[PDB]
Amino acid sequence: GDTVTVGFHDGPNRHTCTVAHKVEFRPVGREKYRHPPEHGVELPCNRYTHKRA
Amino acid sequence: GDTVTVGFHDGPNRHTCTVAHKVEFRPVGREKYRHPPEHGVELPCNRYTHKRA
């Protein structure tokens, strides 16, 4: 996405926040997808964790 | 967007309406963005008002 656009809903109001940021997702590999598939080989990508510890 | 797609929700039904229209947003400037940023110079764009008066 050209931008990033964030927001919750308190309940009385939308109350969001939005920003510019150049985003892309190349997967690691000589394939230039636009999105991760369900299958294919695994290989060493860079990525953030689920966790807090 | 290639199209424009409008709609409210009365509450019992979606009840929307949609249409074709070629849309783009060039910002005024020699930069061909896809979206307005948070910063940068101000310069004389064309734009519609918030108001009714």
Binding site: K22, R26, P44 | E38, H39
Partner: protein, 400 residues
């Protein structure tokens, strides 16, 4: 019997030489240079990575100036600004209107990805190449040992003592200057630590990941925030680590010459098939069989039957073995024309046993040394049809 042998550098194929010790029975070799991992001498010059303009929160003095100082942060860009009216949650808050001062400061810092996703420069010298040479020797039938190339190093793993190289083919596929990224290695003339032009590769240049000091030519230029609102215009080149990932060059494991593969591991360049290696072994004399115990095979005859003018061991030839005793008989073609799949052939009392081989000359006139009995296996060969699979066993092309 210290069997010196010049030997082609090529990885995935044995080199079944023959020990011609005068006095006892000869013994075949099977020298397969399973690897040619290199590990040149190198130096970590600087990690680079994409910056992060981790802005320290600007000062806002409400009526009058706040002179900035040049703090020692890397690329500590700081510029005082006046003429604001900063809307912060209550409209503006500073009651003046021009004496409202805003001091923006921003320095460059290693990303969190710098630790992990980071290019890596090197000044690369030549170092010393290695190999996990298998020899399924003689009747020993096994040793898979890691060795060197420098021509006085033995490696007594198994029972045999073996001295390798130095190879003549000193092409380090690495250039002098190299950049490295995860696994893709780039023989790139990185500018240097301390210099890299902003936007260009190495805008951030940290010695290592821990190194708090660095060189950040990012052309970071702060601009004044707009229309009396709190924020920090940082105008900056996205990194030369951002590019160099999508306007880069191709990797040396995809552009090298003379047949190499690469790893972000000890910085080896595996399996570089080029030139020859003067290899010499001191066999254990116990492994020898004395000459008076192997059958003498002479008064024989050899002939091809279906010679395949090819790479895979398609060439075959019956041999009218004329033995004295019965048993094993190591074999080899001392001429490099023919490469043979069988090191050893079993023999009854003067039978016949075909072997497999491969050649490159239409009329293969190669000697065959069946345990001290030479013979010309002259004949003629046929071209194949089916040539799209990995690398050959023939490796003997010459004038034909």
């Amino acid at each position: 019997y210290e069997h010196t042998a010049v030997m082609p550098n090529k990885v995935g194929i044995p080199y079944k030489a023959l020990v011609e010790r005068p006095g006892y029975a000869p013994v075949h070799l099977q020298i397969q240079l399973v690897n040619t991992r290199i590990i040149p001498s190198t130096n970590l010059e600087y990690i680079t990575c994409k910056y992060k303009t981790k802005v320290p929160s600007p000062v806002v003095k409400c009526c009058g100036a706040t002179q900035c100082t040049s703090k020692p942060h890397p690329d500590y860009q700081c510029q005082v600004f006046t003429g604001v009216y900063p809307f912060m949650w209550g409209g503006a808050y500073c009651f003046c209107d021009t004496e409202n001062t805003q001091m923006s400061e921003a320095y460059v810092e290693r990303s969190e990805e710098c630790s992990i996703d980071h290019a890596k420069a090197y000044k690369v010298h030549t170092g010393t190449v290695q190999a996990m040479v298998n020899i399924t020797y003689g009747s020993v039938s096994w040793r898979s040992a890691d060795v060197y190339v420098n021509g006085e190093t033995p490696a007594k793993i198994g029972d045999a003592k073996l001295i390798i190289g130095p190879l003549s083919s000193a092409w380090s596929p690495f250039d002098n200057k190299v950049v490295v990224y995860g696994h893709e290695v780039y023989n790139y003339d990185f500018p240097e630590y301390g210099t890299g032009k902003a936007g260009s590769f190495g805008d951030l240049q940290s010695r290592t990941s821990t190194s708090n000091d660095l060189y950040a030519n990012t052309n970071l230029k702060l601009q004044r925030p707009q229309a009396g609102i709190v924020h920090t215009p940082f105008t900056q080149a996205p990194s030369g680590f951002e590019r160099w990932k999508r306007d880069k060059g191709a990797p040396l494991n995809d552009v090298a010459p003379f047949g190499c593969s690469i790893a972000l591991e000890p910085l080896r360049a595996e399996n570089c098939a080029v030139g020859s290696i003067p290899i010499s072994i001191d066999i254990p004399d116990a492994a020898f069989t004395r000459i008076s115990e192997t059958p003498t095979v002479s008064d024989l005859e050899c002939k091809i039957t279906e010679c395949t003018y090819a790479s895979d061991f398609g060439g075959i030839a019956t041999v009218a073995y004329k033995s004295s005793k019965a048993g094993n008989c190591p074999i080899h073609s001392p001429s490099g024309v023919a490469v043979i799949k069988e090191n050893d052939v079993t023999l009854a009392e003067s039978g016949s046993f075909t072997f497999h081989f491969s050649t490159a000359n239409i009329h293969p006139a190669f000697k065959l040394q069946v345990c001290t009995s030479a013979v010309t296996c002259k004949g003629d060969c046929k071209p194949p049809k089916d040539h799209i699979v990995d690398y050959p066993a023939q490796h003997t092309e010459s004038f034909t």
